Amino acid sequence: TIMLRGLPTTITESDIREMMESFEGPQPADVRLMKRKTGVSRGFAFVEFYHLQDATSWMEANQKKLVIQGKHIAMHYSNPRPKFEDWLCNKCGLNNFRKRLKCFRCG
Ligand SMILES: [Zn+2]
């Protein structure tokens, strides 16, 4: 899970994956361009991985090497930022909300 920010308001989830079949590191598992309620993508997008060596090598050599729409974008770690009454999942280790009973990785 690595986030990249600043994707324009007309970019398809494919538009980032049309040129991300060629960067370094072994091929990933899942890519999620964050959506909204009306059906728009607000600037940020997460990348999951099969392995951790692959993500490490991805951020290793080309952190500040990815240009689309004439603007560089950072590729930064993703660590949860919780609140007071937040729980944990015993099969994914993913932090999720309190008024919801299901995790966002397996359920
Ligand atoms: Zn989980």
Q: Which amino acid is at 30?
A: D
Q: Ligand 1 centre and the CA of 35: distance in Å?
A: 20
Resolution of the coordinates in A? 3.5
DSSP string, 30-87: -EEE---SSS---EEEEE--S-HHHHHHHHHH-TT--EETTEE--EEE------SS--
Q: Ligand 1 centre and the CA of 96: distance in Å?
A: 8
For domain 2-77, which architecture applies?
2-Layer Sandwich (3.30)
DSSP-assigned beta bridge partners for residue 33: 45
| Owner of token pair 């991985």 | 49
Q: Ligand 1 centre and the CA of 20: distance in Å?
A: 27
Q: Ligand 1 centre and the CA of 78: distance in Å?
A: 15
Q: Ligand 1 centre and the CA of 62: distance in Å?
A: 29
Please report, in angstroms and rounded to a whole number, the separation of the first and last CA atoms in the chain.
Answer: 18
